[PDB]
Design a protein around this ligand. Structure first.
Ligand SMILES: CC(C)(Oc1ccc(CCOc2ccc(/N=N/c3ccccc3)cc2)cc1)C(=O)O
Length: 248
């Protein structure tokens, strides 16, 4: 199906980091396993260590939104939608996509950061004071079960495309058409999963469960976000991310 080929190529063009790239790397990355190694990484690769780390998260968040936006625009049909719908889908979709794609750079030990040249451990993140330690853990939890599906980039591209073109985001104008868009993408995905993962012909419905879990993961994230907004002064939230979260 040509739709699979376009989305995949759009995803390779638009996402600087992808799974095969991240796996080749994890197969020489710098390891932030402690403060001493944190500071060293802040010398080369990119105020409390905690809020520093947080700020780095926001930077990465913003870059990925930009890339998701550009990826969206390259999805057949997307640019032909009304603007308020292009905005709506992105608004409600970026964080599900972000956390789905975050899985590609996480193993049980930690996650790649600084465009791949850094690696921050899961443990070191958990050692952090509250609530900042509660930020990455649920994402690591999601990632482990997600990576267990062993999707590749050709799968993930379609999965992210489906997250984005989602007929049930609140406030859509042309729902009928967006439903059909999603149907077409979901269709490509299912068949693609059937040819690319014959060993689990029910991998498709499992990914639908993943979608549900992403919606719940993100909801919980926004709450922790709202907590950190009200706890820590010195942890300012980037106005772009703040706009994304507004009335979400
Ligand atoms: C508030 C915010 C930003 O929440 C999020 C938190 C995490 C993520 C996923 C990406 O997370 C990262 C965490 C740490 C990173 N550190 N990189 C370095 C580099 C050098 C030195 C120290 C750390 C990078 C990514 C997404 C969102 C949100 O709601 O957007």
């Amino acid at each position: 199906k040509s739709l699979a080929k376009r989305i995949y190529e759009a995803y390779l063009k638009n996402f600087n980091m992808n799974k095969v790239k991240a796996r080749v790397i994890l197969s020489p990355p710098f390891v932030i396993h402690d403060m001493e190694t944190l500071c060293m990484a802040e010398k080369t690769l990119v105020k409390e260590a905690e809020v520093r780390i947080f700020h780095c998260c926001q930077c990465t968040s913003v870059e990925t939104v930009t890339e998701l936006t550009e990826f969206a625009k390259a999805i057949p049909g997307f640019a032909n939608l009304d603007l308020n719908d292009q905005v709506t889908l992105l608004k409600y979709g970026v964080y599900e996509a972000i956390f789905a794609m975050l899985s590609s750079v996480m193993n049980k030990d930690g996650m790649l950061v600084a465009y791949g040249n850094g690696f921050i451990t899961r443990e070191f993140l958990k050692s952090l004071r509250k609530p900042f330690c509660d930020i990455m853990e649920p994402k690591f939890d999601f990632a482990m079960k997600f990576n267990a599906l062993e999707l590749d980039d050709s799968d993930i591209s379609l999965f992210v495309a489906a997250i984005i073109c989602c007929g049930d985001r609140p406030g859509l104008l042309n729902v009928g058409h967006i439903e059909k868009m999603q149907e077409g993408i979901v269709h490509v995905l299912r068949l693609h999963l059937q040819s690319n993962h014959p060993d689990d012909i029910f991998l498709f419905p499992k990914l639908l469960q993943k979608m549900a879990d992403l919606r719940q993961l993100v909801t919980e994230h926004a709450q922790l976000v709202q907590i950190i907004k009200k706890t820590e002064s010195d942890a300012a939230l980037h106005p772009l991310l703040q706009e994304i979260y507004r009335d979400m």
